[PDB]
């Protein structure tokens, strides 16, 4: 029973959620931000944190330092649409006048990390990975999506003396929606770095392999009968929408891919006070962190505009921007649908992986 007042609940503390929480905090609008972790995860640097000693502490930022009592650690199990509540594992419910859904994507470690944990435990998880990689002479990266391609390049750039094999089910690497010129140069670069590519093969004994853990001997098998002996197997396939929090309640609304369908104001179909942003929004985009932030300014503005009776603003997708990091000294990609080269990507993404951006948003300084 909110009797006109606002109470905004942000479910998910990723790039979008912290963008929305910071906007609401600047306008002094009551809000509660919920995340299962206690710190924000700059997952765009997760692969460098998998290979560089001491980097991982640059990639987690305490929520409570920035948001204080406007943050609440918890796992969201369900939405009660009728009574405008948000159901937390353990019983607690959070009442909202407006709801921002920002639940991001789920995937294998190290590319994603969606574990309830402390900041120091999360950091330690990546430092542990680095020791697995240091220990290993032979490493297999499974999956030539954008994540595997960068993971293999990241290992070879930091450890030229390791033997890195990348195994991928198709014949072209990285996202299908990229310029063919982009996809080809990614192959050129991986080969010049000494990565051994096993294209058009599928790993067949995967349920039996130890993941993210050094072993003296591991044999990876493919459906074509190729056997690759290795010390470490890193899995880089299986990014999907994290609908844990909202699926039971919006089944009618979830598009097939897990995302919530939305209008051009990022409103969830069938609701005027429920927004979806970033990865969980059905936008036919490639799903980018920077987009998650833009969506967040859109959603907060449209909550304020909906109270101040004003025309909502819309989200106008443009041409494809995505830069692939090929280690710290190389890369390639496209900015608004045209090709950008190695020097450009190295200065934009590959040196700092946009890490300083999240620390600025969170108003904190890295350790
Ligand atoms: C895999 C990958 C992705 C890249 C990459 N690079 C870029 C890049 O250069 N630029 C960019 O803009 N995006 C890039 N992205 C995409 C970017 O990582 C994602 O699109 C971005 O993180 C999406 O932002 P969202 O806020 O939509 O989602 P997050 O996963 O960041 O945050 C979701 C949060 O919700 C929380 N959460 C979800 N369900 C929950 C629940 N039920 N209860 C509690 N918390 C929950 C999660 O724990 C997590 O903290 C990249 O190189 C790779 C390899």
Author numbering: 7 to 373
Q: Which passages does the manuscript contain on this structure?
A:
Next, we determined the crystal structures of hFSP1-6-OH-FAD, hFSP1-6-OH-FAD-NAD+, and hFSP1-6-OH-FAD-NADP+.
In our structures, the additional hydroxyl group at the 6th position of the isoalloxazine ring in 6-OH-FAD generates a new interaction with hFSP1, which is absent in other NDH-2 family members. Additionally, Glu156 hydrogen bonds to Lys355, enabling the side chain of Lys355 to be located within the hydrogen bonding distance of the isoalloxazine ring of 6-OH-FAD. Moreover, the isoalloxazine ring of 6-OH-FAD is nestled on the hydrophobic pocket formed by the residues Val50, Ala153, Met294, and Phe360 and hydrogen bonds with the main-chain amides of Ala295 and Tyr296. The adenine ring of 6-OH-FAD is stabilized by the carbonyl group of Val82 and the side chain of Asn248, while the 2-OH group in the pentose moiety interacts with Asp41 through hydrogen bonding. Overall, our observations suggest that Asp41, Asn49, Asn248 and Asp285 are likely required for the binding of hFSP1 to the 6-OH-FAD body, whereas Glu156 and Lys355 are associated with its binding to the 6-OH group. To summarize, our structures first illustrate the molecular determinant of hFSP1 for preferential binding to 6-OH-FAD over FAD.
